[PDB]
């Protein structure tokens, strides 16, 4: 339900 790209681009 959640793409890995969310974390790849924003998780500090």
């Amino acid at each position: 339900k959640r793409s890995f790209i969310e974390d790849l681009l924003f998780n500090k």
Epitope: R2, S3, E6, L8, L9, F10
Partner: antibody, heavy 126, light 107 residues
């Protein structure tokens, strides 16, 4: 090289649905998302949503949930946004954009990439 | 999710411009910066808080501390006159662009 080419401008009547296409060529990295961003005249950029084109997982902004669909047609290398129940305030330039990271085999690291279509003016008027 | 920017910033040619971007999730989420000129699509000038894209001049830099991300343009030039938008997300994956800042390079 990568390319993003959007469909031409369209006038739509209130209550109808607008479909905007974005041909995305050359994007083979697994971590690629195609996003849609709109901008009314003199207004800020507004992120509408995106789709992870490797697994088709979508993320729609809260304001557009129930009205917005973002699709990826792998066979045609075509991304689409569909915005239904159009209102006057939906008049804006709609942009597609490809974002993500590449495995940079040259340096051995990763490279963030960021590419934008030319924009599509959707005019909502009866 | 809301990211707050000053509506307008003025800078003398050759001086330093600073554009702030306030968001509650910036301690956990990266900020991106985009430059937009009239009739053009936005152009990335900073990604991941402080990383400078390959084609962006060295006078562009940025940082993030607390709930404030700051874009710094040293030695501002006439070509740097544009609208600037920060961009990030919150802890519930709500993406947002900032309210935007019109940077005038005083002529």
């Amino acid at each position: 090289e990568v390319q993003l080419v959007q469909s031409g401008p369209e006038v739509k009547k209130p209550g109808t649905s607008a479909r905007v296409s974005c041909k995305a060529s050359g994007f083979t990295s697994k971590n690629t998302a195609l996003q849609w961003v709109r901008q009314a005249r003199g207004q800020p950029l507004e992120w509408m949503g995106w789709i992870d084109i490797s697994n088709y997982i979508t993320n729609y902004a809260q304001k557009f949930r129930g009205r917005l669909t973002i699709t990826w047609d792998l066979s045609a290398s075509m991304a689409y946004m569909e915005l239904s129940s159009l209102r006057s305030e939906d008049t804006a330039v709609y942009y597609c954009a490809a974002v993500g990271k590449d495995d940079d085999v040259l340096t051995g690291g990763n490279k963030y990439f960021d590419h934008w279509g030319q924009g599509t003016l959707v005019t909502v008027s009866s | 999710y809301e990211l707050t920017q000053p509506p307008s910033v003025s800078v003398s040619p050759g001086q330093t411009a600073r554009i702030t971007c306030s968001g509650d999730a910036l301690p956990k989420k990266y900020a991106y910066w985009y430059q937009q000129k009239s009739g053009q699509a936005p152009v990335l000038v900073i990604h991941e808080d402080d990383k400078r894209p390959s084609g962006i001049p060295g006078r562009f830099s940025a940082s993030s501390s607390g709930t404030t991300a700051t874009l710094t343009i040293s030695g501002a030039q006439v070509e740097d006159e544009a609208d600037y938008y920060c961009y990030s997300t919150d802890t519930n994956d709500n993406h947002a662009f900032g309210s935007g800042t019109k940077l005038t390079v005083l002529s």
